[PDB]
Amino acid sequence: QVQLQESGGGLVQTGGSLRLSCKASGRAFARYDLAWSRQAPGKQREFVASIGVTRNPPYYSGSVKGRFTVSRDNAKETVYLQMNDLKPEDSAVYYCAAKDASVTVATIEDYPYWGRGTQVTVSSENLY
């Protein structure tokens, strides 16, 4: 049983960066896979990045390839999403989800534990 809270959202100029964090509360943080997802208004929620509990490299959507880095600090019960070279198309609510690493699922939508999401807006309008 784990509770998740995203933070680090904002409104950022095109070409800028953010780092989202997803803080877990509950037992055995080290036994959970964690996944980042994003949802734009009127669109299906989509996979961004996932990180496991082994040495293995994380997984990334083709939509972010190379721009994004997911990482975990097991001591801080925190997963991060560094987001570089942001574009307007990256605007969405970003969500973190957790599932026990031994459980196999067909979709990220089957992860049991979700945060409330953090809003990311990327704007080429120089209000910066």
Author numbering: 1 to 128
The authors write:
Voltage-gated sodium channels, NaVs, are responsible for the rapid rise of action potentials in excitable tissues. Here, we generated high-affinity anti-NaV nanobodies (Nbs), Nb17 and Nb82, that recognize the NaV1.4 (skeletal muscle) and NaV1.5 (cardiac muscle) channel isoforms. These Nbs were raised in llama (Lama glama) and selected from a phage display library for high affinity to the C-terminal (CT) region of NaV1.4. Kinetic experiments by biolayer interferometry determined that Nb17 and Nb82 bind to the CTNaV1.4 and CTNaV1.5 with high affinity (KD ∼ 40–60 nM).
